Amino acid sequence: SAAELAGLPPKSKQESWRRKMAEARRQSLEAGLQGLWQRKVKRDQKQAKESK
Amino acid sequence: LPLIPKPTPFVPDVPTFLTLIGRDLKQHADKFPTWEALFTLTTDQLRELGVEPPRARRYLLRWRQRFREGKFGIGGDLKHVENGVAYLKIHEKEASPTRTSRRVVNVPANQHVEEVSEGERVKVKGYKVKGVSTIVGPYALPVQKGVAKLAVTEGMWEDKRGHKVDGGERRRAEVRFKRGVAERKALREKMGF
Amino acid sequence: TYPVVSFNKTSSPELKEALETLREKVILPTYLPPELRQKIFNKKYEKELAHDPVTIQIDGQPQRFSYINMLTDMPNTPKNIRAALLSMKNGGDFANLSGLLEGMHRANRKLPYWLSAQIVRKACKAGHLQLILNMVRDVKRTGFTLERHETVNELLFWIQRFAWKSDYSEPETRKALREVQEILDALEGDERHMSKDRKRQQALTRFPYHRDPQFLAARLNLTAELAARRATSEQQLNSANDVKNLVKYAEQLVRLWPADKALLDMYTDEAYVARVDLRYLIKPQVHLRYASFTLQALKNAAKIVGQLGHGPLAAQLINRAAAVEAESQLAYAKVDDGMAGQKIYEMVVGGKK
Amino acid sequence: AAATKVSRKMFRELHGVVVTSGLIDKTVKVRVGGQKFNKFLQKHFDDPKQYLVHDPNNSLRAGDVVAIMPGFITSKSKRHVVKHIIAPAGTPIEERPPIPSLDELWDAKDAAKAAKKERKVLREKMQAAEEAIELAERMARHAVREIAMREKIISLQK
Amino acid sequence: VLKLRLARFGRTNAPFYNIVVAHARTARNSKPLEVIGTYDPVPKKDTYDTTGKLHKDIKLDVTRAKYWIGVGAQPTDTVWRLLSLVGILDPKYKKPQP
RNA sequence: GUCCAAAUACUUGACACAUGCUAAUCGAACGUUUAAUUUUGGCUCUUAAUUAAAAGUGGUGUACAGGUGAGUAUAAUAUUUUUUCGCUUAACUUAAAGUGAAGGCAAAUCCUUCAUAUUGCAAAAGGAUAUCUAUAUCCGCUUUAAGAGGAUGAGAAAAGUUUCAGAGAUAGGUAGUUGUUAAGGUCAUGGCUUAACAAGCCAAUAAUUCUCUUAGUCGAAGCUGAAAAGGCUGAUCGACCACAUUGGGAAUGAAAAAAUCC
RNA sequence: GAGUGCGUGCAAUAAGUUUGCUUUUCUGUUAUAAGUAAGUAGACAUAUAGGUUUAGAUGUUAUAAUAGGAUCCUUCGUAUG
Ligand SMILES: [K+]
Ligand SMILES: [K+]
Ligand SMILES: [K+]
Ligand SMILES: [K+]
Ligand SMILES: [Mg+2]
Ligand SMILES: [Mg+2]
Ligand SMILES: [Mg+2]
Ligand SMILES: [Mg+2]
Ligand SMILES: [Mg+2]
Ligand SMILES: [Mg+2]
Ligand SMILES: [Mg+2]
Ligand SMILES: [Mg+2]
Ligand SMILES: [Mg+2]
Ligand SMILES: [Mg+2]
Q1: Nearest partner of C177 among C118, C142, C231, C229, judged by Cα
Q2: Is there contact between C283 and strand G, defined as CB under 7 Å from any strand atom?
Q3: Secondary structure of E41-71 as H, E, C letters
């Protein structure tokens, strides 16, 4: 949010929750895409290695 | 663990507590010998005393938890109640030379608003002032200009269960049809024959 | 919800002509459904309406509607309202304003902004202040809103004159004080009285109507006239309450009304420019009309408050009174002879009767 | 940037015989080989297929042996193109119009498609241009009236 | 609306759940998009542990669940409580201290 | 024929059905209606409000869940792999901007319409709670850019796959139909569309069409064999199709995907 | 002789519905006409007053053209014969 980037505090208890939920979805999406990517690379290397 | 909350001026005893939450729970007002029994009996003990059906027992255990946490219904934050009746009055402050802030406060029925001190001038939540000298809020009946009473009523805090009209959506046209038959058939017996 | 408008009490044939003209072509069509109300003004249905004219059951007797040439047959609302308003001469006649203004409100007729100030004057001078106060209270129906700084200033002028006409007796001054407060409470709380025309005039004055020093001086006048009578135990418990308000209101007026500023310098300089916004105060005739009781109020309050031992207020109120008197005297010199203002000021302030 | 060039990819090459020719312009029927496997009998059956091939210069005759390539869409039923003649029928190859290379046929599609875009940008700019003119004239008739009516009021306040 | 919820399986008096990624408006036990894990509500006990402590076995593919929470999946109240313990989301409910 | 647990339980008449229930919810969208309560004017009537109930109006959901197997005889704009793509005005996730003005119904977040929104076409809706001796918030609404999802476009190209019930009859079928030129349309491809020419294209052993009989389809889903691209079934489980007394239909909506509607 | 949840021809046909040498009507643009009804601007004057007069840039009313949507008619069309 433009307010979070500027460094402003939460306006109310509801926005504070929206900040935590939005951050939880950002942290999980980053850890999800990377975690699921290493699985693919680790799976393709094994196939390419055994098929060779 | 089973901490008991202290009674409040608006809910002083069990008969009042069971009268507010509704669901026809005031029937069992005699099962609980004291205020401490209500907040001490367990699920199994409430079942032996005869608090049934399970819907009423679970509903009671729920409101029993809300009272502990302080999640009262409407008017539960009052502080000056007498025989179950509380009077709401308006307190006016000059927020600016061209404005005025009005708050619905609860004070004794005799003392005037300006006479009461800040300590006893309680501000009830859920009630506001519309325009001037008008108190708006659930179960706020007017007594005079700038005054309204709030009396304990059956089901005042009740979570009313939903009810069907003419048997709901599926059986709406049929219940109205058959009902229309009973009407016409009645008129024939009155004026027809 | 409400009963259909009707005009069944008219003392003159001219009045009945104007009221029945608007009724049968400007008011009654408003009671028809939105569809039928379109046929009456359509040539394509002129033939049909001639045979089976649209009917609506009011009081049983159906009211027939035929084709109406929207341009050639429709009457002029401003002129008809004038012909009726000028022919009203009896209480039975003015009772029609309640229904007339209701019908215009239903027809969405944007009446002249000054029309309210005129109805208040011609009606109150005839001795029908209640008919006005009743329409104001029933604003949800009559649309008689207090959105003009002049209407409120005109209405509060008569509410005092009726009390002053009886030498400020307790039975009447008590009644007037209830009316003045009912208006200041409607201006503040009731939302029917708010409009863009009012927000503009409140921006030019910078005081909301319910706080405008010119209107608060009315409530201060009647209050100052209740304490003067006594300042029986029941009366003492009440008389002692009037003094609490007198010092309360007086101490509030001085906070709003600036120092050494009269009625023409009270508001911003841009307020007296527009002819639709507080320009009436420029004419000496209309200035003396409103600066009479206001000048008399500050003087009276300044004396009582002084007796109670309030040095500041005793000097603050005399500061305004001295400012309004200096200006009021100018108007008394520029006003033409035989004018209403010159007579009122001469009677209220001059006390010549 | 705005040029959508053809894929320009090379697919497989099939050898076949020309079955019909001269019936339609720049089109011949070519019979190629094939073999479909029957899973119940567990054997292969000859599965020859006849396609409509694109002959740009009409250089093929019936009974001719040619090499075709798929992936060259020209019509609703033509997805093959002639690559070269293996064995001619009737007359030698040099006595027939030459067969363009796939590059020449692809360059024609890019050139033909590019010209189509140039014709659109102009028809779009001109259409938008002639539209703004009409929208501009309305501003004139509405301005001369408003200006004539607004300057009049300003002239009565000097 | 994608949801991370539970699919009730097992036998009478023997509940067993599948953590699944399914559209909200579908049958509870219909074939979902993915099976993220399993959940057994009845707490178990270690074989050779006489301390009396109990535990609950829960298999969960945290990496696959984080991706769905990141794209806008809505877990039910039960799955929310589980995801909050592992440390992905914040609890929706807490024991009042006062 | 003693007990206990799990699992299964109209396979036939998609035969007819008494009775109670399976889809409702929001008063923080909206006013009506009587009830008391309290205030105005008049001298019981008559104003303006508060409160609680009962019907409604509007929003979302009844496009999910649950039931049945009557009809239905198939190769299809079906489907798998790789390459290349397109669309998406509801709901979910992240963010930005905008949330003004009238009229109709008793009123409205209903209906109608306007201003404004890179150029010029094109939007919106309000409600609620606190603070002070007007400000700030909460829940929404409109638009825009993305992620996810999708029932999405005939997507396209290359190479493949699909055991298509039983019996009988039928040799023609195709008329933008097949191709060329030109133009338009399309992300792109394709008579997809149009004009002008050519007479083609598919099929020849039944392509195409028709009659009769029977049937919901499929899966290591169930039973069975040592085994066969095994056989049989098509309950319980999952997927798909169809149906909601029978027949004939349309609209709404992001999408018919309704036990809805005509 | 009896039946027929069957196909098909012809006539007929509710809901719905294609086309256009059908018919009414609503709305949005464009160009005009009017300003008496409405509504919006400007000028002048009066005073217990708030009248007189003019004006179309935005609205309103009317006509024409044009665009689109609802009506009616036409076509197709269950039952039925
Ligand atoms: K369904
Ligand atoms: K079936
Ligand atoms: K026929
Ligand atoms: K017919
Ligand atoms: Mg061979
Ligand atoms: Mg059965
Ligand atoms: Mg089945
Ligand atoms: Mg707004
Ligand atoms: Mg290949
Ligand atoms: Mg075609
Ligand atoms: Mg069958
Ligand atoms: Mg017809
Ligand atoms: Mg006129
Ligand atoms: Mg028939």
Answers
A1: C229
A2: yes
A3: CCCECCCCCCCCCCECCEEECHHHHHHHHHH
In this structure, which amino acid lies at residue C297? A
Hey, how many other C-beta atoms are within 10 angstroms of the C-beta on D88? 18
Q: What is the resolution of this structure in A?
A: 2.8
DSSP, res C166: T
Inter-residue long-range contacts of E6-13, CB under 8 Å, 24+ positions, other chains counted? E6/E39, E6/E76, E6/E78, E6/E79, E7/E32
- For residue A33, the one-letter residue type is L
Angle, helices B54-69 vs B14-21, to 10°: value is: 110
Beta bridge partners of D38: D43
From which experimental method does this structure derive?
A: cryo-EM
Q: Which residues pair with D82 in a beta bridge?
A: D68
State how far the Cα of C100 lies from the Cα of C119, in Å rounded to an integer. Answer: 12
| Cβ distance of C189 and B97 shorter than 8 Å | no
From the CA of E25, the nearest ligand is 1
Q: For strand G, give the nucleotides within 7 A of a protein CB.
A: 24-26, 30-32, 36-43, 47-52, 55-58, 61-63
Q: How far is residue C307's CA from residue C311's CA, in Å, rounded to a whole number? A: 9
CA of D77 to C1' of F170 (A): 29
Integer angstrom CA distances of residue C268 from B116, C202, C205, C263, C273: 41, 11, 6, 11, 10
Distance in Å, residue B73 CA to nucleotide F67 C1': 44
Which residue has 């659109």 as its token pair? D120
Q: Which nucleotide is nearest to E70 (CA to C1')?
A: F93
Q: CB count, 10 Å around CB of B165?
A: 9
- Using CA atoms, how far apart are residues B113 and B105, in angstroms rounded to an integer? 8
Q: How far apart are CA E19 and CA B10, in angstroms?
A: 47
Task: Say how far apart CA C178 and CA C246 lie, in whole Å.
Answer: 15
Q: Is the torsion defined by CA of C79, C81, C85, C88 positive or negative? A: positive
Distance (Å) from CA C151 to C1' G46? Answer: 20
Which protein residue has its CA closest to C1' of F136? A11
Residue A43 touches chain E, beta carbons under 8 Å: no
Question: Residue D133, SS3?
Answer: helix
